[model samples]
Target: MSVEIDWDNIRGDLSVNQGVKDFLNSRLQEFELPSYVNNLKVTNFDLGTMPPNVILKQMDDPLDEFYSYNTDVQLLVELDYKGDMSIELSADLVFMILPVKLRISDIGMHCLCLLAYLKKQLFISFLCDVSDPLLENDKLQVDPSGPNFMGKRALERISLIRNIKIHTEGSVLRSVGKLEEFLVDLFRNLIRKEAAWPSWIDLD
Candidate 1:
């Protein structure tokens, strides 16, 4: 349950929404993500690879409280940069299932804090890695973790893109194949990570 959409339809106001940015900044502060992300940047700056107006539909969880839930997802990613470009990415995603009323350790807290941070700030830039200087935080958020009856899942997505189409005017047109390959993988993962229910109460 996912989709591949063109950049044409949604590019008009593609800059990260101010409200979303404000919410994310506040949430990052509350969750202490500014530091963790920087640490992650130190360890994982480039995630090698990975979408657009896309659609996602629900699916049954094959893993089932063994499973937390599932999601039908729809999303879109359009790239319209007009500079010299290079992309570097590194992403880590994890979902854990703590017993009801469980108190998590500081390490666990660090993991969860970043998990929540990823959920809130799925934007397109390095929480750490910066291969290129002219980067605009495409800033977006993707939900990566959910309740799992006392278990956990860890994964990630990271990338850096700079100076696209600067010298190769129609190169983007020529390289559509490479572009879609990454887009599809990204949309697929997003759909798979969708939670059937939101919040810990729902997991219970």
Candidate 2:
């Protein structure tokens, strides 16, 4: 939960001539600039990472590949039923610019359980979207049935025990793209320095 930002250096980095900038000087001196994004009252801003456009490739970056110790890790969030999900990770040569690039990879059958976590969500799209009826119907049928109703739950739900065969691979997030370029666009969308309420990237 500890962040690594030099409060004074960051403030010194901001331009001081602007009216708002001068007004924010004291808060900046106290390292409260991050709160500007957090206090925007935006859910995305409250996620604990940097503001998206401020320079965060702020991904839900939910890939936890901690066991890979000492190697490279990356990320992605794929919207299921198909390609509607998200992808986040490292670029081919990002190391050339930044001194250290930390990669985290979240994978494995248990990891793929994100499928169940996702499927369990209350959204009508995944549960009712006509395009992916199979997944929806599957979820619907299981909504009332006993645990054994869906055979796939064994691999996905974990507690299913002997019910799952675990023969094939499940899905996971991986880092394979140049994230900096991806970051550039992501930043533009999520930051709101000069726009209206509920900015374009506001998910809520």
Candidate 3:
């Protein structure tokens, strides 16, 4: 990512001073200032182990319409499960702020304050899997024999055990309201500084 900061004229025309005036110079130059945030983390999961539910739920098939290449190609994924199975999750968002350049803008005895207009940010990530009992029950019920057996024990195990359907990131991360606002603000602040500093903007 190439950016045209034009540092030469900006610094010179910034009416040369003995202090930092913009966002970049504050933390990167003279200090080890940095902000960190654990935007989200998962702590609970409620996944079921019913094999018939797996097929009836059609978890492997796309949950929504999918189209590619051909504009007229439209198809909607169909679900056929009415089982009382659902995922229950709990998580939290963490935030941190960095005060790198909190200087003065000639406020009385000060040379103007930037006050670490520096910055803050938010990021999120996590990992999750089914419970032990869920897996255990699935295995036991499959290998067991009788009308109690779901039949196709071998085939069902291969499909259900070998493959799983999950999408917390794609569906949850982008859907949360507070999360959306925080992320939007993070980007907005970055641009606002660039716009004020070099009299230009460079997201790169």
lDDT of 2 by residue, 90-196 (tens): 22222132222322212111111111112221111111112323343454232212343334432222211111111111111221132333333332222212111
Runs off by more than 4 Å, candidate 3: 1-175, 199-204
Q: Write candidate 1's Cα lDDT for 24-105 as tens digits.
A: 2333333323211221111111111122112232222222222333232212222222322122222221133211111111
Question: Where does candidate 2 stray beyond 4 Å?
Answer: 1-45, 48-97, 100-131, 136-140, 144-147, 153-204
The lDDT, on a scale of 0 to 1, for candidate 1 is 0.23
Best by TM-score: 1
Return the lDDT, model 3, position 136. Answer: 49
Q: What is the C-alpha lDDT of each candidate?
A: 0.23, 0.22, 0.24
Clashes of each: 46, 7, 13
* Minimal lDDT window, size 10, model 1: 104-113
